[PDB]
Ligand code: HEM
């Protein structure tokens with residue numbers, strides 16, 4: 462409908478999944494708020510518009526269409542008002558910085574060592590499958606109370622939920638172009654229910670220190686628990702992004718450091734630079750790239766576009782983090798970029814609740830990897846491909862080292 466953006470009609474879902482950055486560079490210049498036909502929604506592409514929409518009093522959270530088809534209600538990302546306040550109060554205790562600092566080292570560091578011990582003398586490894594994902598999922602799984610769910614299963618679940626949640630393509634009539642793409646999300650949920658329903662059965666009667674037990678019990682009247690149907694969608698929110706994103710952020714940070722060998726050596730030699738390297742990694746390839754959205758609650762004008770009430774806007778934070786109004790040469794990883802605000806954790810009342818936790822998981826994992834393999838090098842016989850529009854990260858990271 463917007464004439465000068467007719468080229469957007471030829472943008473495909475596969476193009477955005479393989480590399481959304483060329484399309485979004487055009488969007489940031491041509492239309493910071495733009496309706497993308499294959500996505501069926503307005504998208505915010507610049508830092509200014511994403512931040513404005515994420516923090517505006519005239520917008521509230523909305524789950525994307527494929528996200529809602531995947532998670533249902535009440536996903537913490539998709540609700541507001543009293544339900545959102547309750548779900549935030551439910552998840553926040555274990556994520557409080559003073560609480561994280563009590564146990565994060567004893568949680569993540571032995572896990573990192575366990576996975577490293579399997580390959581650190583091999584001289585070769587694919588770090589996404591052998592290290593970044595296992596550490597991410599084993600750390601969160603143990604915190605949640607899923608100690609008995611193997612890391613290969615947690616990784617399979619977040620991969621299936623990822624593809625279902627981002628199964629966003631719509632056809633010429635605005636209907637989902639790929640309805641079969643939700644089936645593997647439904648199968649993952651069915652498997653999760655089979656595993657987790659007995660655990661909830663047990664936690665209701667015998668609460669323990671697992672996070673999901675506290676989600677059932679915290680803040681409830683005596684002898685009452687939150688209904689499992691009320692907390693399952695937020696369990697799914699965790700079993701997708703909370704399981705997936707720390708591993709993605711680790712791996713993207715490593716790919717960026719390998720792209721700047723001098724900076725990789727700097728960080729190996731001085732591990733106090735790991736937090737800075739990670740912050741730049743998150744900006745450089747944002748793990749949550751375009752997964753969340755807001756919806757207008759009254760008529761509003763954003764970036765010159767008059768939106769009616771009830772208009773969804775997708776928040777493409779991964780594009781906003783390449784906003785050249787903010788950053789010079791943003792497609793280059795640069796550890797020595799000044800530490801500027803970024804949107805990799807979102808903004809507003811629905812901003813990431815687990816920032817402090819996630820930053821420490823990533824930090825500890827990279828600390829242990831560099832201590833165990835200080836001569837780590839990328840395997841240049843291998844290419845690194847990144848995949849994902851909703852969630853983005855490298856699909857493999859082949860490395861080598863002299864042993
Ligand atoms: C590096 C890994 C992570 C990245 C890049 C990250 C980035 C985000 C982003 C972009 C959002 C959406 C914010 C918005 O719409 O404005 C988010 C929502 C959230 N994240 Fe994180 N996240 C990360 C790891 C976690 C972890 C490990 C947890 C849990 C332990 C976590 C708990 C949340 C929760 C509960 C929400 C929903 C917040 C709400 O809607 O009220 N995140 N995260």
Ligand SMILES: CCOc1ccccc1O
Pocket residue numbers: 538697698699700701702703704749752753
């Ligand atoms: C823990 C955050 O997980 C998500 C965030 C935004 C969209 C989907 C998610 O699973």
